[PDB]
Amino acid sequence: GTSKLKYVLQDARFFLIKSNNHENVSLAKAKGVWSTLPVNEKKLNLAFRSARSVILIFSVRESGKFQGFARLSSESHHGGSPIHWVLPAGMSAKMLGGVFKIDWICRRELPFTKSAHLTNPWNEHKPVKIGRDGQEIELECGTQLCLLFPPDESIDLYQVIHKM
Ligand SMILES: Cc1nc2cnccc2c(=O)[nH]1
């Protein structure tokens, strides 16, 4: 069902995550972590303290799809075991040092063709698939985008509701 999902998404904030490669999203799915550039790390930390749920919606460049979405369960933290991200050119491990813990809400794909009717007011009302890494998605657009994903029956949202 979709009712617990709607409860998790109620008054959430939503951010677009754009990865150049599939390997980093697969690591994030396996380890429940994500790291981003400092300019976005600061925005996510502010958002984490400001809202019941902060949702990251992931898309791999050139894939034509979103790969899933997840909820921040912590602010960024430093000093843990290094995650072996595949680092894009011009991006170093020191730049991705801040690690957020995330709980996946959906690990299934959504092709851009299914989200063509959704535009993001915070990016000039361009289709929601369009945006730089870290682009915030307005509440209604983001909620409808997350509801478009096929249900992920492997996930039990009871545990993430308790974290709100
Ligand atoms: C973990 C990580 N991977 C990426 C891959 N491509 C572009 C940006 C990123 C990023 O901010 N973080």
UniProtKB/Swiss-Prot annotation:
Changing R132A: Reduced binding affinity for N6-methyladenosine (m6A)-containing RNAs by 100-fold. Regulator of alternative splicing that specifically recognizes and binds N6-methyladenosine (m6A)-containing RNAs. M6A is a modification present at internal sites of mRNAs and some non-coding RNAs and plays a role in the efficiency of mRNA splicing, processing and stability. Acts as a key regulator of exon-inclusion or exon-skipping during alternative splicing via interaction with mRNA splicing factors SRSF3 and SRSF10. Changing R132D: Does not affect ability to influence alternative splice site selection. Changing L56E: Does not affect ability to influence alternative splice site selection. Changing D133K: Does not affect ability to influence alternative splice site selection. Changing L37T: Reduced binding to N6-methyladenosine (m6A)-containing RNAs. It is found in: Nucleus; Nucleus speckle. The YTH domain mediates RNA-binding. Residues 12-149 form the YTH domain. Interacts with SRSF1. Interacts with SRSF2. Interacts with SRSF3. Interacts with SRSF7. Interacts with SRSF10. Interacts with CPSF6. Interacts with KHDRBS1/SAM68. Interacts with TRA2B. Interacts with KHDRBS3. Interacts with EMD. Interacts with RBMX. Interacts with ZCCHC8. Tyrosine phosphorylated. RNA binds at K18, S19, N20, W34, S35, W85, D133. This is YTH domain-containing protein 1. The modification Phosphoserine is found at S81, S92. Changing R132F: Reduced binding affinity for N6-methyladenosine (m6A)-containing RNAs by 9-fold.
